[PDB]
């Protein structure tokens, strides 16, 4: 059943999925539009989503940000941007004061203008995240207040949802429902200090966000549903189109990456293709997806397929260098000289050699050499970074020699010479430093040092040290 | 006292499964990128397989960025890019890790033959793999609904079952599944339940598997390993320098294959994290998880799935498993070999001038080898200012350095070794003698030990460095300290060829020669008579000699007399030291006699006199052989005059039988046998003609007309002395050679009539060629078989070492002369020699103890036993030794290159294996494969069967493929009934009584049977006698000892019958077991002591069990051993040879036995 070799358990697993009809593509894409627009509208119905954008533009003109980090532009320059944002702020400052039944008609239009803005994906993500996190904030108090009644103070949930729905803020449910003389009613008193105090952040939500706990759920719930529809449809599309990825990736086989690696990178490319596709331009999804998949494949190959990573332009350069070789090889009768393709190429032309070197892939250290025996290439690589013991002994002896010779000079000259150099001490010392230490400073030291050298210069002293210089 | 925290000198080692947190403990950073180096500036890209931050600085004590370059700043972590500046060596040490996205199976525990994840979960392998590949769903903690815990479901099935039960049911798939299974698993509860189930149901099938599995589980619990660790959350990365990118000539780079693999792993991992963050469809992320699994598997152990190939190169890439395993079968770099400093080698030459304690060492070689000593000795005397100047001097080869070299050489031994090292004598220590030349000079008497010809064989030299090595080489490996083969007490220093032709030519006698009949005062004027040309080397003469006998008490008696001897014998006598009687030199002095001279000298005078004796023997043998003028001409090989006539008559016989086949009186095959027989008889006749003519034909006159003696012809003297040549080869020279045989083995009926002295024609030569090629092939093959055999032997023995002094058991085997079928195929004296007596022995009359309980029987004791008629002696052996985990020296015997009792701590297993192995080249069901069969205890092809129990037997039932045999013991119950196939002809009498172990059929019998139905002494006796039959039929001398220690190693394990401590049927150490029942017989339970049954394990099988896992990982399949040990959390205490060899410390034997013992007692103590 399963031969293993994961190429197969993939090839067979995807091969179940049926190819889409030309109409099915448009059905699915329409579904995509439905989902997304649902989340967009759900974003437009959030007051904080508006106010935040406003504050952010107040920061943009204050030079604390840039127009590129807020909008990707609207449907449609800084002046046009300024006036569009002016329009937005206008609808906001009207809708805000009209909260005194009729206001809805404007709160709808307030969404519309807010929908004119095409947000940077990052900003959009920040908004959505803010919404769902705020819903975490709501769920915190919902579950706190629920557990403090049901789990701790022993109340049934069936009677717990009765005064909940429609209110879940004011004192109608907390203070007026404990007098009901139910078996669970008098038990609500022990926890009353904990429920009423944590009810502060609850009602607070209807202040910051500007929505009763009722709406806060409905809106981003609708959002959740929309996102679901979106991801569902897009996934469906990609799953339908994997075969294309495979068929393309078969071209890129031996470039130095594995088959499944190829088709996976290409799969990612197909995902991006679904994410950026618009069916309204009439362009066939096939030939549109092809470029993207081929792009992901080639880009990835260029990037990760070597032990030594090389920049893209360099790779392409090498390739051109290969083309020239292919043409001029039989044309020149043997092969073009190493400097031949050089002038054929635009750049400084000695670069060939340099490039021609760095292009080469490193030879496997396990590459077997003669006898077929355990002799392998890496066995013969010698450590050149090791210091030979023959020298190590001399490094050990030089210390004794220079120590004895440094026992020779006057105790102060010895200190000055051991100081001017790193002898038996940390780092080494500037002559000014030596001066400040010794209290007898500047030119002085430089003189003593000289004479010190002079004492060790002519041989009695010199016969021991001179033997060291080879 | 505070015990310690940081570095000590460690003991044992431990191996187990690795926690993710542990893998993190090792890891000094997470390598997040496939990048290696920057591509222009070759600096490591930060957090990549090669990295400065995670692993270490590129150059010594230098930050990567270049800020802190000073040897002062050290513990500093650079602010720019954190790198603690420290030696580049730490890039050879520091590990790393990678946090994988999805869990991953560790391919070793999935694919090891007894799949660990599989049998821990009682889950079949193919199912688990089907789960890992996302080919099906598996349940975990099914609760009570419809479903088994380990049950597997398909897509639709999982859907349906899920629709039925939302919760209180759980199923996963992929790696996360298996990991969840392992984590959820409660071993203890399974233990309880399995104990119960073991108890309730009675079936063999049920409780066998039941007990095996419960034992497995509880072992795994006791380990400290938690099952989850078989699934890798984190993957450790190996230090960069152990998989280096280092540059080459031409600016090219070369790197280990582990980089490709690690790279792939990191790539697919990161891409998986990406695919998770992109909310990819299942079919994609699944493929990615699988690919990651494959990449990781390929990294750890490649080849158990797809065998991935390296970039642009077809050849599969070497994985970490392949890194550990190595190649050339099982070789771990302490095994196949290791390169060594202070060494050399070259072509070898003779050097007869040498004393036996020295060897010629080429000048230049000595200079280069001893170069560091020379440097130190040069500046110690002050001839060189500093070490640099010393180098300059020895490089200049200044005149003064040679004397200094003569200084450092004097008392400093060197080790000499040859190519096929078999027995310990393959390496011998010598005192170096400076020689002008490029060739190594090696003492002639040693040539036998090395099996070294002079045809261009090479020898390798090794300089013992440390003081302990010098003294080891001098007191152990020294040439003079081994004069005797460890296999048998006979001298290996026996004179070889030229020398024995010399001593043979010297003492021999012709009929009439110069100085015949005269008389001389002593050997002095005998030699003086010879050198002056007055008297001939060989002439019958009476001379006065003074011999000695030490036969007083420690004292040499003197006696003088007129001996009838020759001139040559008289001259030679000057050499023979002290207490030896003149009787020894008064013979013809053949190789055997010339050897026994040495042997007696050693068993009388001691070591030193024997050494110098052998030396003088060599010198005089060479000198006099040279004087002798021995040579070989074409006329030295004498063909029988009657040859052609024999040929003709024997050729008449063939035409007789041919005429009969023409007339049809005889059948073709019968004819074939007839003709072959007449030709064979012919060859025998010609051989026994040329032998008489060659041997006795000297016909020479003393004072009369004629007398005849043994020939002085060169080739005869050579063949007779034992120098070189033999009756067969000489027969091939003069007489006709043999009858050949086609590769089939059908012997050709037209033999080679011509010999080598005559010409062979075309056909004859062509036919000889096959014999030649098959000869070379077979010999070159038997070398390999020998090596393999010795290998199995030391593998099965090794760690066996003399440990205790005397176990003090009366136990031992009855030693009789071998007495086979004829007269005495081997005496009693050889079998009992050097062996300790188990108990006192008797004269024919008694209360007279000749040999008193346990005493080494040396030559004098054995001769005292020989004076008396004693046919029987009970002797302590290594197989019967009461001591556990080793042999007591008192049991072993004396045998060694020294005649004294075996030392405490010498490793006997090795020398036994070697002693059995070395002659193995000289062995021809029978043969070396027969030897192998014996040591492997293989049940033969057509074995006999022995009576299970004594008492009257009869036949029962019928013809089902077995006609049953019913045995009837006298007092006891009958029911033993064995099924004997009746198509095999029986022996046992239907109406007669048969003792247990009698012949119920014919053919060889499996030693398992001999062990069970006869018993331990009987089985060890069978093995030793049969293998010794094989060797002795070839003329190979091997003491019974070595074979007996191998035998002891064979029977090391046994299966229990009764109970009261451990499990019922377990095969286990009889050391452990016996020490447990000896301990159980008192204290403890009053006696609960269990009964076992001795088992026989073949040598290749017995080698499998070794306490130390490091040892097992050497010669066994490494991959399996490491896993199997890791699951049990096995803790290797070393304690053996091989393990300590691998880990690189002192061997727990020999010189090191004082160390390891002193440490052994410190362990498990205060
Ligand atoms: Mg040879
Ligand atoms: Zn730095
Ligand atoms: Zn013993």
Account of the protein in words:
This is part of a larger assembly, with chains A (470 residues) and B (1166 residues). Chain A is an all-alpha fold and 470 residues long. Chain A has three domains: 1-309, RNA Polymerase Primary Sigma Factor (Orthogonal Bundle); 310-387, Arc Repressor Mutant, subunit A; 388-470, Arc Repressor Mutant, subunit A (Orthogonal Bundle). Chain A is 62% helix and 2% strand. Chain A is built from 20 helices and three strands. Chain A has a two-stranded antiparallel ribbon with strand order 1-2. In chain A, helix 4 runs antiparallel to helix 5 and helix 6 (121-152) packs antiparallel against helix 9. Chain A is extended and about 115 Å long. Chain B has 41 helices and 28 strands. Chain B has 1166 residues and is of the alpha+beta class. Among the domains of chain B are: 634-782, RNA polymerase Rpb1 funnel domain (Topoisomerase I, Chain A, domain 4); 1099-1165, DNA polymerase, domain 1, CATH 1.10.150.390. In chain B, helix 34 (1016-1033) crosses helix 35. In chain B, the strands form nine sheets. In chain B, strands 9-13-10-12-11-14 form a six-stranded mixed barrel. A three-stranded mixed β-sheet of chain B has the order 2-3-7. Chain B has a three-stranded antiparallel β-sheet with strand order 5-4-6. Strand 3 (363-364) of chain A pairs parallel with strand 8 of chain B, so a sheet runs across the interface. The complex binds magnesium ion and zinc ion (2 copies). One zinc ion (ZN) is lined by residues 63-65, 67, 78, 80-81 of chain B.
């Amino acid at each position: 059943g399963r031969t293993t070799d994961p190429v197969r358990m993939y090839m067979r697993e995807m091969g179940t999925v049926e190819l889409l009809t030309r109409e099915g593509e448009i059905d699915i894409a329409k579904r995509i539009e439905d989902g997304i627009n649902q989340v967009q509208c759900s974003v437009a119905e959030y007051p904080e989503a508006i106010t935040y954008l406003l504050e952010q533009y107040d920061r943009v003109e204050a030079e604390e940000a840039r127009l590129s980090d807020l909008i990707t532009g609207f449907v449609d320059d800084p002046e046009l941007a300024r006036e569009k944002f002016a329009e937005l702020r206008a609808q906001y400052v009207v809708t805000r004061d009209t909260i005194k039944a009729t206001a809805q008609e404007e709160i709808l239009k307030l969404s519309e203008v807010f929908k004119q803005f095409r947000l940077v994906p990052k900003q959009f993500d920040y908004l959505v995240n803010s919404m769902r996190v705020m819903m975490d904030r709501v769920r915190t108090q919902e579950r706190l207040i629920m557990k403090l009644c049901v789990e701790q103070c022993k109340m049934p949930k069936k009677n717990f949802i009765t005064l909940f729905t429609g209110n879940e803020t004011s004192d109608t449910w907390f203070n007026a429902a404990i007098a009901m003389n139910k078996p669970w009613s008098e038990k609500l008193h022990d926890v009353s200090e904990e429920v009423h105090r944590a009810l502060q952040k609850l009602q607070q939500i209807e202040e910051e966000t500007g929505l009763t706990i009722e709406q806060v759920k409905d809106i981003n719930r609708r959002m959740s549903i929309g996102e679901a529809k979106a991801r569902r449809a897009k996934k469906e599309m990609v799953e339908a189109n994997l075969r294309l990825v495979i068929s393309i990736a078969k071209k890129y086989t031996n470039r130095g990456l594995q088959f499944l690696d190829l088709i996976q990178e290409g799969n990612i490319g197909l995902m991006k293709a679904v994410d950026k596709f618009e069916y309204r331009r009439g362009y066939k999804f096939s030939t549109y997806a092809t470029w993207w998949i081929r792009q992901a494949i080639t880009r990835s190959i260029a990037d990760q397929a070597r032990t030594i990573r090389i920049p893209v332009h360099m790779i392409e350069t090498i390739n051109k260098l290969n083309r020239i070789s292919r043409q001029m090889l039989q044309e020149m009768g043997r092969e073009p000289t190493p400097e031949e393709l050089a002038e054929r190429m635009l750049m400084p032309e000695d670069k060939i050699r340099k490039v021609l070197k760095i292009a080469k892939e490193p030879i496997s250290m396990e590459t077997p050499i003669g006898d077929d025996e355990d002799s392998h290439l890496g066995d013969f690589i010698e450590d050149t970074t090791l210091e030979l013991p023959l020298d190590s002994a001399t490094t050990e002896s030089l210390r004794a020699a220079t120590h004895d010779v440094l026992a020779g000079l006057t105790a102060r000259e010895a200190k000055v010479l051991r100081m001017r150099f790193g002898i038996d001490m940390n780092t080494d010392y500037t002559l000014e430093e030596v001066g400040k230490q010794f209290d007898v400073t500047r030119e002085r030291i430089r003189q003593i040092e000289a004479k010190a050298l002079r004492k060790l210069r002519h041989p009695s002293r010199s016969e021991v040290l001179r033997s060291f210089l080879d | 006292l505070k015990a310690q925290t940081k570095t000590e000198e460690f003991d044992a080692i431990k191996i187990a499964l690795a926690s993710p947190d542990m893998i993190r403990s090792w890891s000094f950073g997470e390598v997040k990128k496939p990048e290696t180096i920057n591509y222009r500036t070759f600096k490591p890209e930060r957090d990549g397989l090669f990295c400065a931050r995670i692993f270490g600085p590129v150059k010594d004590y230098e930050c990567l960025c270049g800020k802190y370059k000073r040897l002062k700043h050290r513990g500093v972590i650079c602010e720019k890019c954190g790198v603690e500046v420290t030696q580049t060596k730490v890039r050879r040490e520091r590990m790393g890790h990678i946090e994988l996205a999805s869990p991953t199976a560790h391919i070793w525990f999935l694919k090891s033959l007894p799949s660990r994840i599989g049998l821990l979960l009682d889950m079949p392998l193919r199912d688990i793999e089907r789960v890992l590949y996302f080919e099906s769903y598996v349940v975990i903690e099914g609760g009570m609904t419809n479903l088994e815990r380990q049950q597997i479901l398909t897509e639709e099935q999982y859907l349906d079952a899920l629709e039925e039960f939302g919760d209180e049911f759980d199923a996963k798939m992929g790696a996360e599944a298996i990991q969840a299974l392992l984590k959820s698993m409660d071993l203890e509860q399974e233990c309880e339940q399995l104990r119960e189930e073991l108890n309730e149901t009675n079936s063999e099938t049920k409780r066998k598997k039941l007990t095996k599995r419960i034992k497995l589980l509880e072992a795994f619990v006791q380990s400290g390993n938690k099952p989850e660790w078989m699934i890798l959350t984190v993957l450790p990365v190996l230090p960069p320098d152990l998989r280096p990118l280092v540059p080459l000539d031409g600016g090219r780079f070369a790197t280990s294959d582990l980089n490709d693999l690690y790279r792939r792993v990191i790539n697919r991992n990161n891409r998986l994290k990406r695919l998770l963050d992109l909310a990819a469809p299942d079919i994609i992320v699944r493929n990615e998880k699988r690919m990651l699994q494959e990449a990781v598997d390929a990294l750890l152990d490649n080849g158990r799935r797809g065998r991935a190939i390296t970039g642009s190169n077809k050849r599969p890439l070497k994985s970490l498993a392949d890194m550990i395993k190595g190649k050339q079968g099982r070789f771990r770099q302490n095994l196949l070999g290791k390169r060594v400093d202070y060494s050399g080698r070259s072509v070898i030459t003779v050097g007869p001038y040498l004393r036996l304690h020295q060897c010629g060492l080429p000048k230049k070689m000595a200079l280069e080898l001893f170069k560091p000593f020379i440097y130190g000795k040069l500046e110690l005397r002050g001839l060189a200012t500093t070490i640099k100047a010393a180098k300059k001097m020895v490089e200049r080869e200044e005149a003064v350095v040679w004397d200094i070299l003569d200084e450092v050489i004097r008392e400093h031994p060197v080790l000499l070794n040859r190519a096929p090292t078999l027995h310990r004598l393959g390496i011998q220590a010598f005192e170096p003698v400076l020689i002008e030349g490029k060739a190594i000079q090696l003492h002639p008497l040693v040539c036998a030990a090395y099996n070294a010809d002079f045809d261009g064989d090479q020898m390798a030299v090794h300089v013992p460095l440390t003081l302990e090595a010098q003294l080891e080489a001098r007191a152990l490996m020294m040439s003079t300290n081994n004069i005797l083969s460890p296999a048998n007490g006979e001298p290996i220093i026996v004179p070889s060829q030229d020398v024995v032709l010399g001593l043979y030519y010297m003492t021999r006698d012709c009929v009439n020669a110069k100085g015949e009949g005269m008389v001389l005062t002593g050997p002095k004027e005998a030699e003086r008579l010879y050198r002056s040309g007055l008297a001939s080397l060989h002439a019958r003469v009476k001379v006065r000699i003074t011999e000695y006998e030490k036969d007083a008490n420690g004292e040499l008696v003197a006696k003088t007399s007129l001996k009838d001897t020759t001139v040559g014998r008289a001259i030679l006598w000057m050499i023979v030291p002290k207490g030896l009687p003149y009787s020894i030199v008064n013979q013809a002095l053949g190789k055997k006699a010339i050897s026994k001279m040495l042997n007696t000298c050693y068993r009388i005078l001691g070591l030193k006199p024997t050494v110098i004796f052998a030396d003088q023997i060599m010198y005089t043998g060479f000198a006099y052989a040279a004087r002798s003028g021995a040579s070989v001409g074409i006329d030295d090989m004498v063909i029988p005059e009657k040859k052609h006539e024999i040929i003709s008559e024997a050729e008449a016989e063939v035409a007789e039988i041919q005429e009969q086949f023409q007339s049809g009186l005889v059948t073709a095959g019968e004819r074939y046998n007839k003709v072959i027989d007449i030709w064979a008889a012919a060859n025998d006749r010609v051989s026994k003609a040329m032998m008489d003519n060659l041997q006795t034909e000297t016909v020479i006159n003393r004072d009369g007309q004629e007398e005849k003696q043994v020939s002085f012809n060169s080739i005869y003297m050579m063949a007779d002395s034992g120098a070189r040549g033999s009756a067969a080869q000489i027969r091939q020279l003069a007489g006709m050679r043999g009858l050949m045989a086609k590769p089939d083995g059908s012997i050709i009926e037209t033999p080679i009539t011509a010999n080598f002295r005559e010409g062979l024609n075309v056909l004859q030569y062509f036919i000889s060629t096959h014999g030649a090629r098959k000869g070379l092939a077979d010999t070159a093959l038997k070398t390999a078989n020998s090596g393999y055999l010795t290998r199995r032997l030391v593998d099965v023995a090794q760690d066996l070492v003399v440990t205790e002094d005397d176990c003090g058991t009366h136990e031992g085997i009855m030693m009789t002369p071998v007495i086979e079928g004829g007269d005495v195929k081997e005496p009693l004296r050889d079998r009992v020699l050097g062996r300790v007596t188990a108990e006192d022995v008797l004269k024919p009359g008694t209360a007279d103890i000749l040999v008193p309980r346990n005493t080494l029987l040396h030559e004098q004791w054995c001769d005292l036993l020989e004076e008396n008629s004693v046919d029987a002696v009970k002797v302590r052996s290594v197989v019967s030794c009461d001591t556990d985990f080793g042999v007591c020296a008192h049991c072993y015997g004396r045998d060694l290159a020294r005649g004294h009792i075996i030392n405490k701590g010498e490793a006997i297993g090795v020398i036994a294996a070697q002693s059995i192995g070395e002659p193995g080249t000289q062995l021809t069901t029978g043969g070396l494969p027969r030897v192998a069969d014996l040591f492997e205890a293989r049940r033969p092809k057509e074995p006999a069967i022995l009576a299970e129990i004594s008492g009257i037997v009869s036949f029962g039932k019928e013809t089902k493929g077995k006609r049953r045999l019913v045995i009837t013991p006298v007092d006891g119950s009958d029911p033993y009934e064995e099924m004997i196939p009746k198509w095999r002809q029986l022996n046992v009498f239907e109406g007669e009584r048969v003792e247990r172990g009698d012949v119920i059929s014919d053919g060889p019998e499996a030693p398992h049977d001999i062990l069970r139905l006869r018993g331990v002494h009987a089985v060890t006796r069978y093995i030793v006698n049969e293998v010794q039959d094989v060797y002795r039929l070839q003329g190979v001398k091997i003491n019974d000892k070595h074979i007996e220690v191998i035998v002891r190693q064979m029977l090391r394990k046994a299966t229990i019958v009764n109970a009261g401590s451990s499990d019922f049927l377990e095969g286990e150490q009889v050391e452990y077991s016996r020490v447990k029942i000896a301990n159980r017989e008192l204290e403890a339970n009053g006696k609960v002591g269990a009964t076992y049954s001795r088992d026989l394990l073949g040598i290749t099988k017995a080698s499998l069990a070794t306490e130390s896992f490091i040892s097992a990982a050497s010669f066994q399949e490494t991959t399996r051993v490491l896993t199997e040990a890791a699951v049990a959390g096995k803790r290797d205490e070393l304690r053996g040879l091989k393990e300590n060899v691998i880990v690189g410390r002192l061997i727990p034997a020999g010189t090191g036995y004082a160390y390891h013992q002193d440490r052994m007692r410190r362990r498990a103590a205060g």
